[PDB]
A paper describes a structure:
Our scaffolding system uses a DARPin (Designed Ankyrin Repeat Protein) as an adaptor component that is genetically fused by a continuous alpha helical connection to a central core comprised of a designed symmetric protein cage with cubic symmetry (12 orientations in symmetry T). With these ideas put together, our scaffold presents multiple symmetrically disposed copies of an adaptor protein whose sequence can be mutated to bind diverse cargo proteins for imaging.
Numbering used by the authors:
A (entry chain X), B (entry chain O), C (entry chain N), D (entry chain G), E (entry chain F), F (entry chain P): 2 to 119
G (entry chain J), H (entry chain K), I (entry chain L), J (entry chain A), K (entry chain Q), L (entry chain I): 23 to 190
The structure:
Amino acid sequence: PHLVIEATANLRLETSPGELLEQANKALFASGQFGEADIKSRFVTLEAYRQGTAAVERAYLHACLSILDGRDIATRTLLGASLCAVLAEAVAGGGEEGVQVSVEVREMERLSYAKRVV
Amino acid sequence: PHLVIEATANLRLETSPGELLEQANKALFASGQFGEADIKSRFVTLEAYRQGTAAVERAYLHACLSILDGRDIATRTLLGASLCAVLAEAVAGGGEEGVQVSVEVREMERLSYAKRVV
Amino acid sequence: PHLVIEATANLRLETSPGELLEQANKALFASGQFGEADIKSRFVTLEAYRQGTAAVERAYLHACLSILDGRDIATRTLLGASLCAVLAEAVAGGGEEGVQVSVEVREMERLSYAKRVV
Amino acid sequence: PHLVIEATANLRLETSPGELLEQANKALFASGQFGEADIKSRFVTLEAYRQGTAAVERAYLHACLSILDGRDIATRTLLGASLCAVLAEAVAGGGEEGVQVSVEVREMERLSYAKRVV
Amino acid sequence: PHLVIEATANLRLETSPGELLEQANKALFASGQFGEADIKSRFVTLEAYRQGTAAVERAYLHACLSILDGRDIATRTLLGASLCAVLAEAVAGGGEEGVQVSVEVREMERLSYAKRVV
Amino acid sequence: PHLVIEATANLRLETSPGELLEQANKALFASGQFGEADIKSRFVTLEAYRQGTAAVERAYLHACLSILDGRDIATRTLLGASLCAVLAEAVAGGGEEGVQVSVEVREMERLSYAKRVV
Amino acid sequence: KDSPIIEANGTLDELTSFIGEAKHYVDEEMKGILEEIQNDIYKIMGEIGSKGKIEGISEERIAWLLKLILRYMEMVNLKSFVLPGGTLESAKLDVCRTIARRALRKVLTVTREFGIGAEAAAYLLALSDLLFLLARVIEIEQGKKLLEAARAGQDDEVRILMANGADV
Amino acid sequence: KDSPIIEANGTLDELTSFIGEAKHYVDEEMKGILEEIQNDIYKIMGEIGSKGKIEGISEERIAWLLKLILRYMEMVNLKSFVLPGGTLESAKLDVCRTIARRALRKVLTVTREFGIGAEAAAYLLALSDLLFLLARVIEIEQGKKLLEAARAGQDDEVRILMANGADV
Amino acid sequence: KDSPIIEANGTLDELTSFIGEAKHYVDEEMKGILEEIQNDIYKIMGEIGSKGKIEGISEERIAWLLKLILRYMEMVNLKSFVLPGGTLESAKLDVCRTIARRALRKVLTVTREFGIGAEAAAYLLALSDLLFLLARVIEIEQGKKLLEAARAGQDDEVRILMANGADV
Amino acid sequence: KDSPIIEANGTLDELTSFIGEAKHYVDEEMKGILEEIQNDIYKIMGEIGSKGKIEGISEERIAWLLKLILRYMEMVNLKSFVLPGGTLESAKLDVCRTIARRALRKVLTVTREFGIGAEAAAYLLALSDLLFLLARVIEIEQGKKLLEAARAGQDDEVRILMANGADV
Amino acid sequence: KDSPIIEANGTLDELTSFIGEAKHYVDEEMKGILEEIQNDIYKIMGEIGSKGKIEGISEERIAWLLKLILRYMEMVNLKSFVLPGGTLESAKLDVCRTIARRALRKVLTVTREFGIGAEAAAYLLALSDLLFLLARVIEIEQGKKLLEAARAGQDDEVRILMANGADV
Amino acid sequence: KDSPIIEANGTLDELTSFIGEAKHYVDEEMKGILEEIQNDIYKIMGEIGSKGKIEGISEERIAWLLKLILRYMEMVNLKSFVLPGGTLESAKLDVCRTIARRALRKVLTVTREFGIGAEAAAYLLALSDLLFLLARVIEIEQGKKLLEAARAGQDDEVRILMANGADV
């Protein structure tokens, strides 16, 4: 499982960007689907961004969780709904209106996936 | 809809990186498929990059538009062809030969997609 | 073919980040599937990252190769296994235990893919 | 089997309304499909009636035989054609032109049909 | 086509029971499905009737149009909706609340249907 | 739901013809399938009737419950068996032998059924 | 998003565009009728495209069509098999009748698989019997304009009617 | 009552309504041709709707179409891929050609399942080759009206032809 | 020769005949646009009829449609659900939009079985969004001709615009 | 030996074991009712397992259920959507109602393929409407035991009823 | 991950939860038997969920069930069709017998498609014949407690046994 | 009225009856949790039975389950494969977990054919991970009642805990 969290620059978080990833890894491990050391997360801040066509100042947050395939839609819907409740409780605000938080769960292919331990 | 535009460092654009995203959001909204405030774009510049195996200096541009599923192939082909005409009219040049501009349209899954407004 | 290599900050490579991409482009061209100038690679280093829930210092490496669709599973398994042997021979080490190297091969859609040469 | 015979008021029969039902019960029993005491007939005369839109004085006769399902179309066509020859030989005439005699055979459902003997 | 109209005894009609059947035969002939002399109508008044379990005085009206089979659902829905507008414009009222008018269209079987002209 | 109860003239009921319909409407409402004001019942006595071919004096009772379609065979079998127990407890006797009580449950079509409230 | 749903919405959008083209050749009375039919096809398209989750037309609308059909059936004296398009104005309404018969066959496929739109298919069946009667009225008041021009003693004004298709 | 029968009758009723609309823009000679085609489509609709129990068109009718096609093929000098609708009058007959190609594909499905209407589908194939030649004649006699107006020395009467689509 | 190929070519030949009929009611600017669309539908018909063995339209053509759509979207101020066919000229272009939606559903069946014509179906989708915007412009410059006639003090020249469908 | 026969016998054997567990929490009147239901499920299992060759329940038994339902429907005053299991004793009978709805869906598959057991499926439908009414009576006489304990002036004997789920 | 595999594992997980509920009402001897059955259902779930790649139960375990069945068959004197649930403790074990018959029908579908678990389905068949014999023993030693209470001259201690379902 | 809809509603009605039976053995804190789960299963049954036309549970409810799971996961120290039903109270909640896994497999068939109830199946998956953690808490506070009874010097009060299944 790879979790890429992409926040804008004007987004004010209640915690550090490092303590947000510790809460997101505990909420992924508590689903009982992944191993402990196989949950890998990263946080990316964006410098140049636009939302919409209007001139109002906005901010957003987006996570893309990539898991290996072979899990039913009840497991993938629970993983997106467990992560979206973690990110939404970390946003203090940004911009001139509400922050949009969204989480995508996508499936990597299991047959062509290579993995090694150096 | 999320639009991630990835340009190299030697690529010279005719405009700013911010004014390229305003033209790409107006060309996505003019297709009549998405809402106004749901079109979220971001621009990423790359420091370390290689194209090909030859020693000639090259540059490229790449956009990946992620939309929710449930749209036919005529809508996704029009979205990639409307964006590729916006990026190709913004490239002044870079490197020692032609710039390659490409646009991928991929489909997020609608059932496992979470969304909130803080 | 787009190759995005994402390494952490504490990962020590045996070479430069630029010479890693020259070895990965020669191992992609030697499969005989892609053209010469169509192999585009980029290297991204990460500042904020977490692996697992434990407090031990870890590092990882991840590549995501995006090719166009229409190739059988024997070709995609060979492309992930040829790239995972290139990245694992470039890692000197990082963290307090072993480095995890993994390669995902995903398929772009051929009909909605736009491409131009400026 | 229930037989409901509906004649108009201006229709002159060659016999009594009671002797018409004795001839219709003997023609239903002679088909060998029903029991003796299970053939139940009734005769209804109509006070208010209209046939067509023209102002010519008409009369008609109509029988609706309801049998239980499970019989082929050769048995139901014979039951309507055996009854229509009984009613047409009992009509003396009525109105200013020919009398229309018609017989419908409809199928009751066997599973939901209740029956008791007090 | 046979049309059986069953009204209660407390129902006050705006016209005679005979002039209601002339308006219902012109609305059946105007659909262009039946012949002129084959539209046969009858009106039945009821002496003993109950609607519901409550003690409030009610009245109702009901028509059952029996046509031969072989017509699509657009023709049968139009025949019930053309007749229900004729009966509802003839009801002056009855009882202590609103009159319920309903029209059923049922299909006789064409193969077992006998018909003669005396 | 329309309930038409057809008794002969020689049939002696334990109650009035009006109090039989109050017991039949409470046994239809207690199945929980129909609304309160949508249960419409009527009682018809017959003057001219014949049962069988023999000369013995007989009597019968018959109910035809017409409900809208879309209900399984367990619901229609329960509606015929709940009504047949109501009518059989109201028959005192008639004729020279046992009274035959029977209940048919038939299905009206839901698409072509019109209904209005004047 | 299903395959019989997008075909039924495509023909109902095709039918309301042919009515909007044919309502410029009719007089001021029939234009008010055809503009109210165009609103009712828009209500059917919302019902079919949402698979019944939005309410459609009421039974009051089909009672409005059939009360118009019973009015025009008295003026139209029926005759033999007459060819479509006597005049140019009545030729445009004979096209819209055959789109409404094609739209009825698409809505009947939605009914036979999804069980919705049985009151919508009863509107398009009563519509195509009105567009047949609306076309036969325009040929008549064009032809009753010929008998008044024969009695008026006109030389040029009688033959311009015959060049537009007035019956003799 | 079958499903390919009501589709084939619906498109043949659609084709004879487009011909009745397009026969008001043509001259007095081509109106007599298009009114006799409308009678022959009515004979095909009686044959297909009864599944062959009623007699259809004779082979005398297809011998009348092909003797018209061999007459108009001499006047139409063939050229490159020209766009449909040079003039307004020849634009109406290019629509009726494409309904006759759609009606031919419906009758060909009746033939491939019920084995009837092979002489009817040979009429609609010879019809759509006449409506192509009928459209190319009207563009020519509109264009030969331009060369006589150039030699007559007209200033306003030459440009009203070019506003209607006369070729230069 | 296959069955979805002859249906997709039959509707694309039907669409380019309706455009050739509707380009005589528009002005000199929109006639040059509609004559270049007719050439591009002819390039799509060669690509689909040969199952991809002949080259079709380029991506330069779809970049020409969308640069026209972004020009007319500024003039068309969007409003509520307006009925098709305000004027007679904008009623002809609302018919061609619904043929282009029918031609898009036929080309989408060729794509879903033969894998060809995905750039062709992206042309017919951008075409039917231009024919919607082209129809709404003609209703506006007809309506802006009404406000200048109200200020000019005209008695007869203002009501002939309202008889053609100018909005008030 | 068939596949829907062994599933229908397995759920009817599951239903009569849940009734035998739930008849120890009810009083002496309802135990006599539930022990006569257990005999009737045993008669249904003999009829279904032999595919109708053995006689099943009579129509006298369904007339005994519905005469009990009409007795308990007067005491149960209906209310809003109340949760299952107010008391512990009425929680055991809300489980047996949902096994009887599962046993009804298995017998309905035997009826729709073999044509047997339509009088058996009418017993399980009237049974699950009695087990709903039997559960709502026990919550009431537990709650009417609370109002007598409020008037008796009890301190400990009123709260042991509220610990068992008596409604306030 | 297949569809008959997750159904067979779901019912075997349902069966070992009903045994864990029913082992608190039995004495200390039968609790040791039911706790060793719960370990064997856990070995079957590992074999079925891995499609045979993990070893399951041995044939030593089925030889342990049948040596218990031959011991309890001597004490249970067989009688007529007795209703399930004589006492409350023997009513809980008549529920677990009918889950083991449902779990046997799920494992038999895994055997008839994947060819695995034939020794597992022979365990659940011998299990449901032990749970029938285990239920009939508890009704007997409850009833032999009634004959000793009749000879002891007890007034209250004899009727509390009859309130728990002791046979007379 | 469809076949996977009545099976999914029948198992969700079966699950909320087992929760109403098992909420009488738990303390006053866990009874408030189980009574709010019973309201949420009633909201799922309205959404599935109407095929999505009625709104179901919100994403606020799944955020309430997972904030309870993260609270009880700290108290439950995980161990080896322990058998279900250590105590009698924790044996009732191990039955409701296996009904929620069966109800999840029925809702997953509604999702894979009708495309509805993906947020409902994510509730039943988070529910059966709470009922596993709720069962393991009751075995612990029963076992921590044993260590206080060993230090209190009790002879009879320590062994009545071991007769109820307290771990040693």
